[PDB]
Structure formats: C-alpha cells, structure tokens
C-alpha cells in the first residue's frame, strides 16, 4: 500500500468509483455526458489510474476535469500526465494554482523542501470557495480547507444507487505535518487556517467520506466488507466528524512536541 502501489478499482456508490493506487486515493465520478477525476496520486501512480479508470470501463478521453486536493506530489504528481491522457481542465484553490502548474511548492508550504517537486500540469485553473462544478448531471462544490496547504479543497456532491442519494466528500488532508525544519509555532496564521478547516469539515453533509490518504477513513476495512454488506459498508456520516477529530488531536500533539 505504497503511494504508487497498484490497486484493483471498485465502485464506492453509484457513480462514484475508486480509481487511485493502494496508498493515495483518486476517484472517478461518472456520467453518460462525461467524468470528473478526483486527483492523480503520484507521478508513478499516474499509470495505476489510467489502467484503473480503463478497467473500470471508461475512456480516458470522456474525463473533462480533474480535481485537485492539494498540491503535494502524493496527490498532484500524476495530475500533469493524466491532464495529458484525458485533455481535461484541472481545477484547484487559488493559492495551489502555480503549484499545479509549475510543480514547485511555495516556501510557505509547510512540506516544501521535505516532499518533491513534481511535473507541472497544462491547463490549471482557480476554483473559489462554495463554487459549484457542473459537468452533465454531475456538480461538485469546493469547499476551502487550507492549513496543510494555502490553496486546499476538499469536494462534495451526490450520488445515487437505487434511489437511494448520499452525500459524498472527499476529504483533503487536515494534519500538521511538515519537514523537520519547519514550525506550526511559528505560522500561526496556517494553524488558524487549519483550525477553520476542521469546523468546516465537521459541518459538511456527510454520508460517504473518502479522505485523500485513504486509510484515515478506513476503505481498505470497508471495502473487505463490502462483499458481503454491498455498498452500504463506505457509508457513515460520522465520518468527517472522525477526519475533523484527528486532524485536531494531530495537532494538538503536534504544538506540544514543539514546545
Ligand atoms: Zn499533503
Ligand atoms: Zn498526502
């Protein structure tokens, strides 16, 4: 379950379908008028979702936009090469545009320098907070989440299986991580940010979370389930309660280590 690992796609609900590697998740929503991608994963990790989204029975070409988290090179790093495959717009928060496009985080970042440059990506544009993303039946809302990045978001919309409608978000990071030499003490400004992040997330409709390290909210342990429970095994709207609860422990132990 490394970042780049390959990973047998599945349908979570409905449209809504894992496409990513074993390690970092990226979902394809589908529609008969053409798909949005939630994220690349990792540039080697790109290959793994092409092959996914192809085994899944779609075509590469019929994806219209990719959607960005955050622009760290575990989730953004295959963005540039499935922006290439697909032809599709990639749609980020403002402050992680440039990052997309050039590769190079922002010193301001708090994992620059730690994590990788990456490939940057052709046709990157800003979506602000709230905004909704209509492609078909599809819309998607960003929603701001900074603090582990400026620019973070973490994207809603609905899906549908026998009548049945569920609120989906995938989530984007909440935790304080950073390279050795970088200090949440120093950047209150981040930490406000993060603060922010998670009462917005606890906030969220939230029946399916589907968070962007996929085990913060279990899918291996619930897509071993699914076998025998269907569908119903991805679904718990506590879940951006829980994201929101650890990102805020993670924190709290994370100010005292640096103390
Ligand atoms: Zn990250
Ligand atoms: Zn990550």
Redesign the pocket.
């Known amino acids: 379950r490394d970042w780049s690992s390959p990973q047998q796609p599945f349908t979570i609900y409905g449209n809504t379908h894992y496409v990513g590697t074993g390690g970092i998740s990226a979902v394809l929503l589908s529609s008969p008028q053409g798909h949005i991608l939630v994220d690349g994963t990792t540039e080697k990790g790109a290959q793994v979702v092409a092959a996914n989204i192809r085994a899944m029975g779609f075509k590469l070409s019929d994806v219209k936009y990719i959607l960005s988290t955050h622009s760290?090179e575990?989730?953004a790093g295959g963005i540039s090469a499935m922006q290439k495959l697909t032809g599709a717009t990639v749609l980020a928060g403002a402050a992680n545009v440039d990052t997309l496009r050039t590769g190079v985080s922002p010193k301001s970042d708090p994992q620059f320098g730690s994590l990788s440059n990456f490939p940057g990506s052709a046709k990157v544009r800003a979506v602000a907070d709230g905004e909704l993303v209509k492609l078909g039946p599809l819309a998607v809302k960003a929603h701001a989440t900074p603090g582990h990045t400026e620019g973070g978001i973490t994207w809603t919309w609905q899906s549908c299986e026998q009548g049945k409608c569920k609120d989906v978000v995938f989530a984007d990071?909440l935790t304080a991580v950073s390279a050795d030499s970088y200090r949440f003490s120093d950047h209150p400004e981040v930490v406000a940010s993060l603060r922010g992040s998670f009462e917005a997330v606890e906030k969220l409709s939230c029946d399916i979370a589907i968070a962007?390290?996929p085990e913060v909210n279990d899918m291996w342990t619930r897509q071993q389930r699914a076998a025998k429970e269907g569908n119903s095994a991805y679904v718990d709207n506590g879940a951006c309660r829980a994201i929101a609860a650890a990102g805020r422990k993670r924190l709290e132990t994370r100010l005292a280590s640096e103390k």
Do not use: T
């Open positions: 760290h575990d989730h990071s962007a390290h």
